[PDB]
Amino acid sequence: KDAWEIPRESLRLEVKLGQGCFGEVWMGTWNGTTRVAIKTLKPGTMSPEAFLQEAQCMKKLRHEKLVQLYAVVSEEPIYIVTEYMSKGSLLDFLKGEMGKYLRLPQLVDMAAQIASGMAYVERMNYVHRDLRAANILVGENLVCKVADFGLARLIPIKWTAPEAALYGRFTIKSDVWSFGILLTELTTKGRVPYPGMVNREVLDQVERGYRMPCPPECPESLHDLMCQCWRKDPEERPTFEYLQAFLEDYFTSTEPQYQPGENL
Numbered sequence: 188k189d190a191w192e193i194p195r196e197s198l199r200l201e202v203k204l205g206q207g208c209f210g211e212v213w214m215g216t217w218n219g220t221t222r223v224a225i226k227t228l229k230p231g232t233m234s235p236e237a238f239l240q241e242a243q244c245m246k247k248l249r250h251e252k253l254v255q256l257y258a259v260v261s262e263e264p265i266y267i268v269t270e271y272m273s274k275g276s277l278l279d280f281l282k283g284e285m286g287k288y289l290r291l292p293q294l295v296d297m298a299a300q301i302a303s304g305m306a307y308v309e310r311m312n313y314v315h316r317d318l319r320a321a322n323i324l325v326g327e328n329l330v331c332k333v334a335d336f337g338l339a340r341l342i343p344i345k346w347t348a349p350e351a352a353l354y355g356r357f358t359i360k361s362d363v364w365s366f367g368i369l370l371t372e373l374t375t376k377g378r379v380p381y382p383g384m385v386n387r388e389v390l391d392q393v394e395r396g397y398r399m400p401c402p403p404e405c406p407e408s409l410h411d412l413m414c415q416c417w418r419k420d421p422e423e424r425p426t427f428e429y430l431q432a433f434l435e436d437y438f439t440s441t442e443p444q445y446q447p448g449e450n451l
C-alpha cells in the first residue's frame with residue numbers, strides 16, 4: 188500500500204554482516220545493478236505492524252549524512268533496503284586496523300559530518316534517542332552517516348543522558364549529550380566510555396557531577412566542547428548547529444597551532 192513497497196525477486200541476498208534479536212543484516216543486490224544493505228526481521232521477536240515505525244522516519248527523512256532508504260517489504264518476513272556502506276560501523280572501523288593511524292583532523296571531520304546529519308534531524312524536529320559510534324556508518328572517503336534511528340521520536344546508559352535514562356525526557360538535547368560521549372569514542376579509538384565503571388555506578392557518579400576527563404593528547408578546547416555537551420541543564424547544552432560550525436572550523440578558529448602527537 189506504498190511506493191516504497193517492492194517485490195521479493197529484485198533483492199538478491201549475498202553476504203552476512205550482523206546478527207541481532209530483531210534479525211540479520213545483509214549486503215545484496217537490488218534489480219541486479221545496485222549494491223544494497225538489507226535489514227531483516229525474524230518473525231517471533233517483533234510483530235509486523237510494530238516494525239512499520241522503524242522505517243517511517245526513514246521515509247520522511249533525507250539528507251547526505253543520513254543512511255538512505257531505497258525500499259521495503261511490509262509483508263512478513265520484513266526486509267528494509269538501504270545504501271550499502273562499504274566500511275561498516277564507525278566503532279568497528281576505529282577499533283580495528285584502518286583507524287590505528289586516524290589522527291585528530293580525520294576524526295574531527297567525521298564528527299563535523301555526523302553533526303551535519305543531526306543538525307538536519309534538529310531542523311526537522313526529530314530525536315535519534317540512540318546516537319553513538321555503533322550507529323554511525325563509515326563509507327568511501329570517510330563519509331560518515333547517522334544510521335539506526337529505528338524508534339526515533341516524532342516530537343544503553345553510558346551514552347544516554349540522565350534525564351532520559353531516568354525520567355524518559357528524550358529530547359534533541361539528550362542527543363547533544365550522547366554526541367558529546369561520541370566525541371570520547373573518536374578520540375580513544377573506539378573504547379567504551381566510563382572505563383572501569385558499570386552501568387549502575389555510572390548513573391550515580393554522573394548525577395553527583397562526574398564528567399569524563401580530557402583523554403590523553405586531546406586539545407583542551409575539544410574537551411571543553413564535550414563539557415558543554417554534558418551540562419546538567421538540557422538548555423545550557425549547545426545545539427547541532429553550533430557544534431557543526433565549531434568542528435568544521437576547528438583547526439582555523441579554535442586550534443590553528445595544533446601539532447600531531449602519537450595517537451592524535
Ligand SMILES: COCCn1c(/C=C(\C#N)C(=O)NC(C)C)c(-c2ccc(Cl)cc2)c2c(N)ncnc21
Binds near residue numbers: 204276335
Ligand atoms: C557489520 O556492521 C555493520 C552492519 N550494517 C548495518 C547494521 C547495523 C549498523 N550500524 C546494526 O544493526 N548493527 C551492527 C550489526 C553492529 C547496516 C544497516 C543500518 C540501517 C539499516 Cl535500516 C539497515 C542496515 C549497514 C549498512 N547500511 N551498510 C553497511 N553495514 C551495515
